[model samples]
Target: PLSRAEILHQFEDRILDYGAAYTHVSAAELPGAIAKALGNARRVIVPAGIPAPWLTVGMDVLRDEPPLSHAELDRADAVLTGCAVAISETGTIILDHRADQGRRALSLIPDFHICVVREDQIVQTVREGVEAVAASVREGRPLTWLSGGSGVHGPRRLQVIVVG
Candidate 1:
């Protein structure tokens, strides 16, 4: 395996190059980092699977228990989530509707998204990312790949916190 110093550099570099805000922090610093990443976001769409600590910021945390309507999700300031895998090669974040990752609608409907990714989940290539999510595919789950694009179904603004 390559050293974290170099591989992780490409991970962070590619994220920035693709026009998404990126921050690397330890587990202890993650909450604050997530807070700063929210910017002016006051209404946050939270998936049922997110950790309680990650929502420490002072804001109205809207849960998706009842499954928010598309308009309801769009009205939210941002969506907060943890990712399934992050590929360094393309700076892509993959989600498979895991409890913490939430449904695809929660991510796509919101204009701005803030994702918290653990360092170990960072893969060196798209192939590796695909391999990592293979089980989900076999289980018949849908995969959402976010690349911080302003396309029809992607987030216009993406803020990511890579916690180590």
Candidate 2:
């Protein structure tokens, strides 16, 4: 098995090669880092369970508690979400639409996606990630597997912040 640092290094390398901007931050600094990455975005879409501190980043944040209208989604500058697991081997992040991650359109319709991943959520391989969420899969939860920014049909850019 790879050491934790080695796994993280591989994950970062692969994600960068996949065209996603990546950052590592302490939990306390995550909100600030996300704000920095978002730059001047006027509005950001988020899930209900996103950290309240994130809302203070000075942007109009629309929570998906009731889901957003198509127009609302289009008007948003970006989407912020949490991922279920990340695969270091393939540089993939998986979202199972948990309360903090929101729905499919939350990540899809926005031009930018900023996904926050915790260190413990990183897995060494695709199989490991799949296994980690196997229960959800069996329960038929909606899942979004992102290799990078949403492709031609989704978000134009992707930013990932791995926090401990």
TM-score of each: 0.92, 0.94
Query: How far does residue 47 in candidate 1 sit from its true spot (Å)?
Result: 0.8
Looking at model 1, report the run of 10 residues with the lowest lDDT sum. Answer: 146-155
- Tell me the lDDT of candidate 2: 0.87
- How far off is residue 96 in model 2, in Å? 0.1
So what's the TM-score on candidate 1? 0.92
lDDT of 1 by residue, 1-164 (tens): 55667768888888888888988999889878877877667698888888888778586798998989988988999999998998876778899989997888888888888899999999887888899999999999999887632126567888889998
Q: Name the regions of candidate 2 deviating beyond 4 angstroms.
A: 148-152
Q: Which lDDT values do the candidates have, in the order given?
A: 0.84, 0.87
Report the lDDT of model 1 for residue 41: 72
